[PDB]
């Protein structure tokens, strides 16, 4: 809920899932030898099958999508921006700061990000971006 989103040991059933997901991804990225295999035709086809299977999944929209058919300066600004600007390239980049695109995968996809000194299984390098606020 809304009260389960703040800090202070609230929302334990989903905070412990997220903290176990990032550690288990870090343990298989470093300590799993069987994942360092060059890809073959069984991997190349079935990943493209698994690429199209996730793309066939459509998100269930809510009831918001249903529709039918001296002014203030704040009220006239919302009506003028909706009619004159149908596509805004400046606001869609503000979404990238909120969603934080590739949050759990760019920790391992960057070039030279993780140092050699923190390449052990006891090391806590996936907790550097944790800010309590």
């Amino acid at each position: 809920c809304f009260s389960s989103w703040n800090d202070g040991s609230e929302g334990y059933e989903w905070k412990s899932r997220a903290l176990s997901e990032k550690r288990s991804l870090a343990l298989e990225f470093l300590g799993n030898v069987n994942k360092r295999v060059s890809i073959h035709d069984a991997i190349r086809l079935k990943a493209d099958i698994n690429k199209k299977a996730i793309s066939n999944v459509s998100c269930p929209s809510f009831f918001s999508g249903i529709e039918g058919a001296h002014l203030s300066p704040s009220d006239a600004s919302l009506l003028k921006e909706e009619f004159l600007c149908d596509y805004d390239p400046s606001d869609t980049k503000r979404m990238a700061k909120w969603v934080n695109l590739r949050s759990e995968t760019s920790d391992y996809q960057s070039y030279g990000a993780i140092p050699e000194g923190e390449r052990s299984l006891w090391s806590a390098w996936y907790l550097r971006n944790i800010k309590a606020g």
Binding site: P115, E116, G117, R119, S120, R128
Partner: protein, 96 residues
């Protein structure tokens, strides 16, 4: 397993402490402690710290990843205040 830039000696004197040096190198060896070089004259080596002042981050330590490991006796207050963070060269100890 020596490094020809840092792990060599300047003097001719044979102190015959190479067995204790390789024993302490095996003692300081860990999971990645065998990847770096072995210095037989590490007990006589004095590497000056080049960062006495600077930005002191809270989320980060004052130590670095690729730092030369100290001796059993080497403390950072041996070099005095007027010479702290000045020497760009590593020193070697010889006992008279």
């Amino acid at each position: 397993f020596v490094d020809l830039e840092t792990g060599t000696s300047l003097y001719f004197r044979d102190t015959r402490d190479s067995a204790e040096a390789i024993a302490h190198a095996a003692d300081s060896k860990g999971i990645k402690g065998m990847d770096n070089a072995i210095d037989l004259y590490n007990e006589y080596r004095i590497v000056p710290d080049l960062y006495p002042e600077g930005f002191q981050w809270k989320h980060k330590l004052n130590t670095e990843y690729n730092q030369w490991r100290s001796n059993t006796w080497l403390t950072p207050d041996l070099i005095p205040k007027e010479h702290r963070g000045r020497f760009l060269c590593n020193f070697q100890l010889n006992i008279v």
